[PDB]
Design a protein around this ligand. Structure first.
Ligand SMILES: Nc1nc(N2CC[NH2+]CC2)nc2c1ncn2[C@@H]1O[C@H](COP(=O)(O)CP(=O)(O)O)[C@@H](O)[C@H]1O
Ligand SMILES: Nc1nc(N2CC[NH2+]CC2)nc2c1ncn2[C@@H]1O[C@H](COP(=O)(O)CP(=O)(O)O)[C@@H](O)[C@H]1O
Ligand SMILES: [Ca+2]
Ligand SMILES: [Ca+2]
Ligand SMILES: [Zn+2]
Ligand SMILES: [Zn+2]
Ligand SMILES: [Zn+2]
Ligand SMILES: [Zn+2]
Lengths: 521, 521
């Protein structure tokens, strides 16, 4: 028997410092979690105890906090190198600052292999990018070798900015030839490490002959065996067992997001590289684990440049600003209401008027806590709106807007980002009904009236809606908006609109007030 | 036969200049109405045609616009003298600036008798006020004499500030001896002119032996025979006929409010002063009647001092601000929502927190139009909030608040001012139910929660509510607030709170959004 311990992270999203339990800014240090200093301590503790260890990342280190807005990936390469990661797979967010934003900060400075078997470069780019990322790496682990094959969401061209030179292939189609090449080289222990979501990860495990383990990301999937340690509810056991088509039991793992947990899987292999068994669980990186002093002092050094975004108080909140995924992708969330109210307010002070707002819940990427004397800084807002998008004005038919709201709940319950937050709209859904027929009530704030009031949406009428450019361009499957819109005007930067509105209000208290409801029946 | 024409006004409330159809500021002069210059033209036209004319006012000339805030009744005495009123009865609003605010500006400068038979002065005041107002006046009208007996709401001590020296008697009890004294003096034509509301006016007509006609006010009652000329819906025919207990047909008249109409009643008397018949209708003072040039030039002279309140733009509205009685005393009105939002905002920027607001609809005393490039001035706000009240903080039990909301609709449909406008509250009424059991749903914005949301009000819990001092002191029959409150802190001046909030928002667009609803059942 040969035992291997796989340590893994995914969707860290620039949470370099320890955070609050909700992954927003750490205020009460005594109860904070995650961060790279705490992760280091745990990884070192495991490396001391276990002789065969691999520390892996399944992508999306890029984007999420002022660390990335300022260091643009230099903090990733630096701290991933300090933690001595063995390999990383490319995620969609590694392409947000173009291919240039991946090459210079990360690929040239990473001391570990960076992987993706389904990204093929064509034309001019092919020449420069060659060899800076690999389809796989064969890693010596003691007296054995372990092959790692990478993969990246085939949806990255739509989700990010990888450019016209990179081609994204079907993951299973691209992986099988690389795994087969590893098998011809007598590499009998193979890990598929990649960034496509738990559903694709299970398909890779079922279909790619020769894969012993799948380590994934993108879906922020929390898996656990037994009673869980924090607020995340498990989507399945850890590991999740897939029975492959050729009859093998394949463990599939993921470790939520934000560096809150360290994924930990122990695999028992035979002499031919068959998985005899495996077990483990994600480790909660809570205050019980001390932050490594050396890494923490280095974090404090890099933190000095960021304190310019933490000094200006933009305003104050006397309520918890719920920007959590568990709220904003499932029901009315007060952060969504705040952002839509700021969106509506911004245009109603612009010239040449609109009362309605729609906002993809997945575009709200962090809550803000009210306990730090309720202070709101640019840094706090940077984590809520980290993408540098704009809030555009569009003219839509009622029919188009009804289709959008049907799309908002067409596959409800999967923590997908299309669920819409709103302003100037009162929507009622009946989830007992079939996809495409779940909107039971859709009232909107009249525009062609002297006193605004809510009246049923009319399919043949035309409404002006303020929304993110992501939705106006057909993102999150809102193809009907892009295809059926009658007008599209570019708007102001998302973060600046909310920042301006908070400074104007000074004290904010957004509530959940019935803009989105769910019927009984 | 001896014919008398009674011309009458009531509840003019400082609308010296012509106004918009809703009695707010005149912007589109071509379609404006009322004002003392237009009234003059009509009165003069009638005086030229009819030999026996009496022009009467049934009180409440005081309070309503920047004219009264600045001239404090000097404009009333001046312009009522210019129009040559024959008599006036004291209304409750004539006592808002104390007895001193009635004596000096009006009683000493009025060239016509000022009447009230049920106000008896006691102690020191008795001596000075003696003879400046009278219980009645016997007026020569051609070769005949007409007796006018005055009366004032017995509720004036609670509604206004008449002081501890004036006693207000039951109107019927005080009137009969004065009418009997007029009858002993062979005065066979008697008009009761007063300010107590249409219901008391009908009782006076039924019960006071010897009264031939009743000319009233206070209830802003619109009466009409036939198809009406504007938006006011008649509460009955003009005149309203009461059959007295001694079997006489007694006409009862009123002429809405704000100088929009001139009441016009022609009475045919026999030689013994019996009413043979009567007929007429309120005359709509619309653009068809020219404004007298002389009075208009004198109005323009007095207007120069007021233009300091019309120059500063506090902000802009892109919606009609519905502060009409027909909306705010009957259902959710967007002016009410604006004021409650300003009330909540003001305390949430004060120190040492509250999410709920209640506002008596009768305290909103004018709308604001959005068509003048949407501009909002101090003058526009002065007509909405003309009383100089404050928005106080109170701590109430849920039981107390439930009783208040029951009181809000206990006598619904009478255009009474107790109907509550709200903030941070969602109330549902069922008017099919009995008084005291009409609140079917009362949800409130939680305070003891990190994310505010609406939850059912709990009878044994305690809530912090911002409301006018008028309600905290038990006004509008809200005795339960004054008696059952747990804490009462004095607040900022009503107009300044709304003014500050509009300047902060710059562009406002308050909607009717479902804070108050009425069920089917
Ligand atoms: N307001 C937005 N702007 C942008 N834009 C692109 C950049 N330039 C500005 C416009 N992208 C957005 C917005 N809201 C959502 N998305 C995208 O939708 C996805 C959210 O799903 P997820 O969290 O499940 C997948 P992940 O993050 O784990 O890979 C991400 O790809 C995110 O980028
Ligand atoms: N916010 C308020 N403040 C005050 N205060 C008193 C003065 N000092 C500040 C506090 N009074 C108020 C408020 N709201 C309502 N009222 C009173 O309620 C009545 C409204 O009913 P109505 O229009 O049918 C009777 P009217 O006007 O024809 O005689 C009036 O008497 C009015 O004064
Ligand atoms: Ca194998
Ligand atoms: Ca008589
Ligand atoms: Zn991610
Ligand atoms: Zn991703
Ligand atoms: Zn009045
Ligand atoms: Zn009155």
């Amino acid at each position: 028997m040969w035992e291997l311990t796989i340590l893994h992270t995914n969707d860290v999203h620039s949470r370099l410092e320890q955070t609050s339990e909700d992954s927003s800014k750490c205020v009460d240090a005594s109860r904070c979690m995650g961060g790279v200093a705490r992760l280091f301590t745990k990884v070192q503790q495991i490396r001391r105890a276990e002789p065969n260890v691999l520390l892996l990342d399944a992508g999306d280190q890029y984007q999420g906090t002022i660390w990335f807005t300022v260091y643009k990936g230099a903090e990733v390469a630096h701290f991933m190198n300090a933690l001595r990661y063995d390999a990383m797979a490319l995620g969609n967010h590694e392409f947000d600052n173009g291919v240039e934003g991946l090459i210079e900060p990360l690929l040239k400075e990473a001391k570990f292999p960076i992987l993706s078997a389904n990204i093929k470069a064509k034309g001019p780019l092919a020449s420069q990018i060659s060899g800076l990322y690999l389809p796989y790496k064969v890693l010596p682990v003691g007296d054995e070798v372990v092959g790692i094959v990478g993969y990246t969401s085939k949806e990255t061209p739509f989700l990010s900015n990888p450019g016209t030179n990179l081609v994204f292939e079907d993951e299973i189609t691209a992986l099988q030839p690389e795994v087969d090449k590893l098998k011809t080289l007598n590499v009998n222990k193979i890990i598929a490490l990649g960034h496509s979501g738990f559903e694709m990860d299970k398909l890779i495990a079922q279909k790619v002959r020769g894969v012993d383990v799948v380590v994934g990301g993108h879906s922020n999937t929390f898996l656990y065996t037994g009673n869980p340690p924090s607020k995340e509810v498990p989507a399945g056991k850890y590991p999740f067992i897939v029975t492959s088509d050729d009859g093998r039991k394949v463990p599939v793992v993921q470790a939520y997001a934000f560096g809150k947990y360290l994924g930990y899987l122990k695999i028992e292999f035979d002499e031919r590289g068959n998985v005899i068994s495996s077990h483990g669980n994600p480790i909660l990186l809570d205050s019980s684990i001390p932050e490594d002093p050396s890494i923490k002092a280095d974090i404090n050094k890099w933190r000095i440049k960021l304190d310019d975004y933490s000094t200006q108080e933009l305003g104050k909140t006397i309520v918890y600003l719920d920007g959590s995924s568990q709220s904003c992708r499932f029901r009315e969330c007060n952060m969504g209401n705040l952002i839509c109210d700021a969106m509506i307010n911004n245009n109603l002070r612009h010239a040449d008027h609109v009362s309605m707002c729609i906002l993809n819940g997945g575009g709200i990427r962090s809550p803000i806590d009210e306990r730090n004397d309720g202070t709101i800084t640019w840094e706090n807002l940077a984590a809520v709106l980290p993408f540098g998008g704009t809030f555009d004005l569009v003219q839509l038919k009622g029919s188009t807007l009804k289709k959008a709201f049907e799309h908002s709940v067409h596959r409800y319950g999967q923590s997908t980002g299309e669920f819409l937050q709103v302003g100037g709209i009162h929507v009622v859904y009946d989830l007992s009904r079939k996809p495409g027929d779940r909107v039971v009530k859709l009232d909107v704030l009249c525009t062609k009236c002297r006193v605004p009031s809510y009246d049923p949406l009319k399919m043949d009428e035309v409404y002006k809606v303020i929304l993110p450019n992501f939705l106006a361009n057909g993102g999150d499957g809102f193809q009907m908006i892009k295809d059926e819109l009658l007008r599209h005007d570019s708007g102001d930067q998302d973060i600046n609109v909310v920042s301006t509105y908070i400074s104007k209000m000074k004290v904010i208290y957004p509530a959940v007030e019935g803009r989105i409801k769910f019927s009984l029946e």
